[PDB]
């Protein structure tokens, strides 16, 4: 059996465990806010995570492939668990610390590059 992290009730299988190896039962599955799923590009832009940090740093981060409502023939969206993405970003960049200044100086350098191009 698997012990849920929230209720502690033993269970055999759960949706999150099958797709993300998360020991959380469907009763405690807060998929609306706590277990929100975001697109691959959104995670890369917000958390400055590269492919290697998403696929090669242990543990590997799984994703769910879902159809795109805008266009079915377009690239199917990949959804990652927000908690896992946050944990990976914290393990790579430390914390909510100077990484913010790092992205600030990144956009400052982008402005520097555009003004130099002008």
């Amino acid at each position: 059996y698997v012990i849920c992290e929230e209720c502690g009730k033993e269970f055999m299988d759960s949706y999150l465990m099958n797709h993300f190896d998360l020991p959380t039962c469907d009763n405690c599955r807060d998929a609306d806010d706590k277990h929100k799923l975001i697109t691959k590009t959104e995670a890369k832009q917000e958390y400055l995570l590269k492919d290697c940090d998403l696929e090669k740093r242990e543990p590997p981060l799984k994703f769910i492939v879902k159809k795109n409502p805008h266009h079915s023939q377009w690239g199917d969206m990949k959804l990652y668990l927000k908690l896992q993405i946050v944990k990976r970003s914290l393990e790579v960049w430390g914390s909510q610390e100077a990484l913010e200044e790092a992205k600030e100086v990144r956009q400052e350098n982008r402005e520097k590059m555009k003004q130099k191009k002008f």
Binding site: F63, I64, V65, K66, K67, S72, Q73, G75, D76
Partner: protein, 677 residues
Amino acid sequence: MKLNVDGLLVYFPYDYIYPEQFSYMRELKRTLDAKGHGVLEMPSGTGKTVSLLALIMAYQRAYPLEVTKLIYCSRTVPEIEKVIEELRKLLNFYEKQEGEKLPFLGLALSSRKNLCIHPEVTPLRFGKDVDGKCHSLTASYVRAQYQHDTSLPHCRFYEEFDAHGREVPLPAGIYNLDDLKALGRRQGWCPYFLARYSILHANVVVYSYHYLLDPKIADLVSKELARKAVVVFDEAHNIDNVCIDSMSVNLTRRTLDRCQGNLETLQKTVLRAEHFLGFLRRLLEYVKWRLRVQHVVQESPPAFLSGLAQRVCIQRKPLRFCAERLRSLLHTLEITDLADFSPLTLLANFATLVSTYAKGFTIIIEPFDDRTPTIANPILHFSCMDASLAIKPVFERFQSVIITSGTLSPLDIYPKILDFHPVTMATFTMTLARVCLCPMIIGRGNDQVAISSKFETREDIAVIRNYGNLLLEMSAVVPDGIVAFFTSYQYMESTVASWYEQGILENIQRNKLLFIETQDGAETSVALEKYQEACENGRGAILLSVARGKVSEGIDFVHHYGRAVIMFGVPYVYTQSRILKARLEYLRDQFQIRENDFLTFDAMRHAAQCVGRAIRGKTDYGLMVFADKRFARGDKRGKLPRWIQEHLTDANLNLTVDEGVQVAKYFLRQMAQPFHR
């Protein structure tokens, strides 16, 4: 000679061994020592079978207890006969190099039509009636009545085999199918029955895929033969596809008409137990209800039995007893012949499957037909969606299942398309004294316009003109036959009609003859024959066909036949019929397979399969061109087999028509020179 692997010595008929063959043998020995499954990929049609058989024999000699039974399932009968004769050559080499015989038995299995001696059943071309006539001639009741010596026409081979062929075994001597037929006719025994009696006391045995993928016969042909056994599916690059055909059935008006015609005869014979007699009568009306319903599509694999149990109020359990009825009730009825009875059997099998197998399947109804869309044609498909169901029984019964073919470029998709645990991830690229192939991707034409076969540009005049110009000025540099493949029959016929309308097809006509492949089997065969005879002399010819056709895999273009193979656009399967999309959804929500990635994989797999048949043998050489800029993209080049990637230099990935022609001329000129061994 005697190849010395780290813990064994293996005899090989050929003194010279290519490094690829040695690496393949090392990898296969590693897999056998690993006691696990795997997937392999080789670029040569010949030379793989001899190496596989030699290593199997060496492993059996070294470890008789570890391996007891070997299976070499192939696609068709020519492969079976060629591997049988290759095994015969290997055994002859072993005998001539050692001097003493060994108790090894090798037999080939096929349908009853292939292995039969009665002259009253050979001439007919009914594959569904040979089994019925064979069962009628000899069965349990025939054996029971043979005690009184009834004067009736019946098969007598079994009546002699059961008293004379079940005592003398065949410890040694590998026998081909014709050899088995000769032995049966000289001993008055049935080849099929002696094959059934001899598989238990045998070393190796080969047959086709349908004897393992179809559960209705695999259990009968292999139940307790060997717990520790080795099976291989050579040339199975489309195995999953045929796996679908293992659990896919279709229903039409002819089937229900035949059923309603024959049920009256069945009832008349009965009145001359009751748990099924009245059960079968009202089964047809439920499925004919959908005939009168004009609806687009209905999908309810779990709820279909619910609708059945609501309309007619039948429990699900008796359906599971339908199959065991076939061997119980029918033998009491003494059916004269299985003709006009097969639809009933397939309906019973369909009912049993939908009662049992409904987790990963889908029921589809299509009110569409070719050239007669909506007149009368509701087609019901119990289409399969997961290839694991057709592959689980062989994986749970065998230890080292190996999947090998000429095109298995993505080794990461097969283990996730079907439940698999590969431990090999091995690819092999053939090498010779010179580069025998010159693959190249031709992008934009002389007008600097892409020649991509996009759906929005299928009717574009510019791409059609570019394709015509490419086929014209290409036909003057490569001699004696060019094989061109189009995306579909509709696109192919539209393009040739457009070429006929312009004054461009006539220019191609004077260089090479134009031959068109159609759906007719006889027409296709005669077109292939005339193409072969035209390529034999200096006239030269062009064979235009489709990538997804029976001619794509039915023939191999040996050297001097089809020096050039042209791909006009990436061949994409049609998204209609609501069959591909169901599989895409199942792979998305079950195996997390990208729809675009799967479509690209299928397209490139078909393209590589139809383009890699121009290289058969070391001395053979050929040219391979792709007439689409989409092939230049990395996501599609990566799907090509490894033995073609290294020969596809980055210099020619988007070159125009003229430079492609120059490259072809240079390659042919430099490959026309003699070489060495």
